[PDB]
Amino acid sequence: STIPSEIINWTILNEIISMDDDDSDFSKGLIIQFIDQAQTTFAQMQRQLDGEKNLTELDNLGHFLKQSSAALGLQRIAWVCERIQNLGRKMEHFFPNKTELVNTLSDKSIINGINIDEDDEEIKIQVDDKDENSIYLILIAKALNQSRLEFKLARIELSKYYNTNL
């Protein structure tokens, strides 16, 4: 499947533009909660990659954040989390380069002010025929770097539509 080109699904973009004051405050609270959730989630995935390397936990973490991001329309985060899930389940063996995924952005402008590697963490896991999990862990590490960028881009977008720094 292909990563969506828009950061926010148009369903949710319509709601944002149409919401009254009560619904807008409520949705803003949801987003603030999601931001704290995703930062906890990413840091738990990083600690796994650096420590126990439990693929089952990495899968559960991606499953959890796919749902919370998708419910807010943040479909690119959701797509990457789905890759992490399926890599953790050993059902995928591929994760696209950052240049390919950035190139799919429908709005070429949200990149140019940003260091897209700023939130990267070095991938220290080696391919090893004695560790059947090594390849999946390396691809999850790549996907986590993509996630952190998609997360920063989603925050920049949401900040524009809610007129405050989220």
Numbering used by the authors: 2 to 167
Quote from the publication.
The HPt protein (or domain) acts as an intermediate in the signaling pathway by transferring the phosphoryl group from the HHK to a RR, which elicits a cellular response to the detected stress. All known structures of HPt proteins share a characteristic 4-helix bundle with a hydrophobic binding surface for RR binding.
The X-ray structure of the Ypd1-G68Q mutant was determined in order to ascertain structural integrity of the mutant and to gain insight into its loss of function characteristics. The Ypd1-G68Q mutant protein crystallized in space group P3121. The root mean square deviation (RMSD) for all residues between the Ypd1-G68Q and wild type structure is 1.9 Å. The area around the site of phosphorylation is unperturbed with an RMSD of 0.2 Å for all residues in αC and αD helix.
